[PDB]
Amino acid sequence: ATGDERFYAEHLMPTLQGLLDPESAHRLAVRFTSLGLLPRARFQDSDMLEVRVLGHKFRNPVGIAAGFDKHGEAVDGLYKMGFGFVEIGSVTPKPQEGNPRPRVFRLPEDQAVINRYGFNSHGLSVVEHRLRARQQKQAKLTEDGLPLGVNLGKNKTSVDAAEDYAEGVRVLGPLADYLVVNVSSPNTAGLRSLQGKAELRRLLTKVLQERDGLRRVHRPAVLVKIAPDLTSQDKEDIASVVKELGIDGLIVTNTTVSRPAGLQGALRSETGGLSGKPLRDLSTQTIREMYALTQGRVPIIGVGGVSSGQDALEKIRAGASLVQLYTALTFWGPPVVGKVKRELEALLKEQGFGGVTDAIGADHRR
């Protein structure tokens, strides 16, 4: 372990969190990232960490989850942190404010966060222009194993959900290596009902048609991001639709509306999605289920409570080809990225895997 890891985790981050309200801290973190006010990412990615999936090379399998850089303001700073891929968003078609403040809450005793942002978004046009300003820089990054994902949401007041996602595909699809159809935010009324079989098939047919209409060089993979709170029936239905339509992958999972027994944080009963440690194993089990239901043939990006190499490898062994983290960054700061990667490499060696690829879904073959 490094001096920076300890300094950030034990001193700098908790001291600053003591001084800054959650959303102010989030805004400052985005600003610091965009400005490159970041510690040295000392860890060099080994060949063992490379993954080929979704029509792309990923230099390492650790990405930043959606919701950190909602508006595509900090993409390059996120690569400088050592993330193998960056996901921005969620982005809505029209700009919208989201919910009133406060709308993000720390649960320090649980290493968790609850948020009810409600898709605060600069909107498609602003994000489009932001991504266009660095489009060729991104093309080079992608070629060098550092892909970009764009996560799409829907406006609060929109009368046609499928048309919102279609607009996102048309506007940001040409700027993305992959798109995410986010049907799992707990903070937009009626959104999670789009995970239902009939609604999902209709929505995804339209999304895929719009994607297929993009020029070849500008044609992204399409993934669906799902909740950790689905019934067994819901999961069976999603797997069926994914296979029927040839959806490129799944992101598993969004935040939970559950409140696991044992939460200690004073703010545990705030409305919103819960992330971090209490979500971890619920998310891992959802990855495990979805991998089995799709016969290991559908790439999964595993997300929820990853804060160590062990957390990452558990999701990989459960069936994730790639992982993301967010809440761990909020507690431990930028050095957490190198920590996860270093620990993951060590564990892969210890468990006799030649690399990440060999470990994907390994628990299912035990």
Ligand SMILES: Cc1cc2nc3c(=O)[nH]c(=O)nc-3n(C[C@H](O)[C@H](O)[C@H](O)COP(=O)(O)O)c2cc1C
């Ligand atoms: C403050 C906050 C905002 C988020 N915003 C989004 C979002 O806009 N779109 C999305 O798909 N997921 C969003 N998420 C969910 C994360 O992408 C991720 O699925 C979830 O937090 C679990 O990972 P973690 O435990 O590493 O944070 C957000 C999470 C947090 C904590």
Ligand SMILES: COC(=O)/C(C)=C/CC/C(C)=C/Cc1c(O)c(Cl)c(C)c(C=O)c1O
């Ligand atoms: C990348 O940011 C940094 O390196 C530093 C030192 C940021 C200072 C502000 C800070 C202590 C942020 C921690 C924090 C938070 O405390 C909370 Cl609650 C959230 C939601 C986020 C979202 O990114 C978050 O980053």
Ligand SMILES: O=C(O)c1cc(=O)[nH]c(=O)[nH]1
């Ligand atoms: O904007 C939000 O509230 C949000 C979206 C999402 O998909 N997940 C989440 O936890 N929050």
